[PDB]
Amino acid sequence: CDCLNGGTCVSNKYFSNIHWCNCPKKFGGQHCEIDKSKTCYEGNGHFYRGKASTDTMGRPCLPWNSATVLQQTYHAHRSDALQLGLGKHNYCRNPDNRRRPWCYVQVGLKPLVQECMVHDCA
């Protein structure tokens, strides 16, 4: 069972046994990886889940699965994407331990790591 948070695994013998999870009301995504409640981030933001498509100066993050980000260090398709919270969305994450959650932001021709909008829960 590869579900996260409060996740109950389920599958179907008739459909190639594809699996998914039953998540509490505040968790979404195939594995309960998305935290639809969290407004602020932790202290490091490493384990922060939740939306935050925006950048410090109001700028849209790139989808961790966009053709672009798929060519960067951290993207949706990496073997550890589920542990890092990198999936088909553009929510601020901090896979690399940076005292602040971030995301890839497109600027002109190249995408660059920009600090996240999300405030600290302190």
Add this chain to the structure above:
Amino acid sequence: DIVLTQSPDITAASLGQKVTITCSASSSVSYMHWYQQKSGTSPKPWIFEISKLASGVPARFSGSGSGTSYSLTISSMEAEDAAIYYCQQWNYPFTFGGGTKLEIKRADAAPTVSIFPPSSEQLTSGGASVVCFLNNFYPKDINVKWKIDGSERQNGVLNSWTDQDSKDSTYSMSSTLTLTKDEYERHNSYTCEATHKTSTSPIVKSFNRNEAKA
């Protein structure tokens, strides 16, 4: 082999009386059914899956139980409820209980005894049967004893009983003593003696082969 024991064996219930039949199982059974049978015709599903009533079964009927004990109950005994009830396990051996005969209890009634000599037709045929009717009595228990010239005769006697009467809830019985025409001609006094709880002394009816008509 899961043994099913039904009780009571046979009971008389007064109209309006509460009746409870039980079926005891040798081992647990998940479901028990009850069938009602009258006059040996097809048993009718009565209560199935322990307590569901078959279509048409009156509300006075209900069934209950679990594991090793089940029971069919009729809150208020009515006339049409007189019959034989059989419980049955729902599974594989499909064994039926021994059955419970439910009859209508009523006030005791002494039998009306009538004795009849061999007819002319039968005698000219070379045979001789003496018939005795003991009609409309209650309860069912009754003893009939035949006597020829005062001595009890048990061989050659055949008995038949009717089921509870529809109208008056009584029973009737017929006893026939058959003997050879010659033995019949060699004796005079023929007696039918009935013992019933309604009397301390036997109801005795007889006739003399010698004394009768011109």
Add this chain to the structure above:
Amino acid sequence: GVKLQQSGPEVVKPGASVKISCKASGYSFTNFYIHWVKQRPGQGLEWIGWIFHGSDNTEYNEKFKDKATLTADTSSSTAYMQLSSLTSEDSAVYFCARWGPHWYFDVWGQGTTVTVSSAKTTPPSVYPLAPNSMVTLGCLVKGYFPEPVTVTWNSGSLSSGVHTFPAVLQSDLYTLSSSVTVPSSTWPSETVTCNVAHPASSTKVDKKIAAA
């Protein structure tokens, strides 16, 4: 709509075999089990066995494994049961019943009467049974075969006060009697006659009860 139609009564000689049918109609025959149940005179119900879809799928009561054989003609939605080497212990009423949706015998055939006997069709001998306000009378129906006979009084006019008793076996033949009670002002000043009918021998006899 849904019913099980059983074949007629059988009189079979001891030692011989008999095969009775149960035609199902009103539902899909091949989707339900058909059970067979035996009931001897005055006794309980005994499960014989079941058949499902066809003759190759049956289950038997250990006690009948060497007495009964269950088969089916799927093309006619009919189940059959054969009983062999019949004795007197086999004289009984045999019912077929469907094991319905809620797992109880929900639909029953009317039953088939099997009489194991060596007797031949014999008409009965009707004898009058003659002896103050009420006077009884019977009628003795002796030595007939097979069952049953029909006894009436005054062509059915006399209904109240009649007792027709179950036949008994006497000399491998049947004997039965009937009593009728009437006011003495009715008999013998008027006529009382028992009408006995034995279809098996195509016979009908009227026996007037004359004062003895």
Add this chain to the structure above:
Amino acid sequence: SLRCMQCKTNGDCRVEECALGQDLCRTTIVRLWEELELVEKSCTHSEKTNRTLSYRTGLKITSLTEVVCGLDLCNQGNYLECISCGSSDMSCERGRHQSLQCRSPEEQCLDVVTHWDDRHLRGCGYLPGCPGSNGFHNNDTFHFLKCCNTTKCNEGPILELENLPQNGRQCYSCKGNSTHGCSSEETFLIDCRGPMNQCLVATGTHEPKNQSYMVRGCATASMCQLGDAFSMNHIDVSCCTKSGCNHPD
């Protein structure tokens, strides 16, 4: 020489060279509304088929659907009322069944029992062995599928094996290989229940590779004609209606 798109739910796709026996491509889609859509693809077994299943479990609605095809990379491209409930939220076990209208004139009412993912499932769809119903049970399994096409024909108390009476038929039970799992010393008699009076033997392939598999137990007639119920692939079934005729001969 069949090839199919092999995609995970994350979107990572790649071409897959089908292994001998897998002459079909499959796209499995799951949709969860309250919507979320999961898509998965790969080569698949020859006897797989187009199938659907939709059921509501409270406020949610889960829609499973699998399409198949046997052409190179064919994989790449993108009102009957029933009763519905589910084991995930104790919907069925609690009698909190709901009405769900199918959205395909091909979808029938389904009632599927999978006792050791959801033990009980009811809703719309079409599955292998649909027209009608089938069942099987042995030393550690009970499967039953009921498929009908009349309004809410799949309603009623949920079916449990304990509510099906022993019929008298006895069949041998086992699982594994003929040497490991289904040996004369491992197989034993069980009491067949309800409509399952066929002593069955199913041989095929389970596990990851082509591991020879085998299962024995009691079954309905309809089961003697797929493998999804036995978790196998190419299933070869044999049946007989005599107690114990199921024994490893």
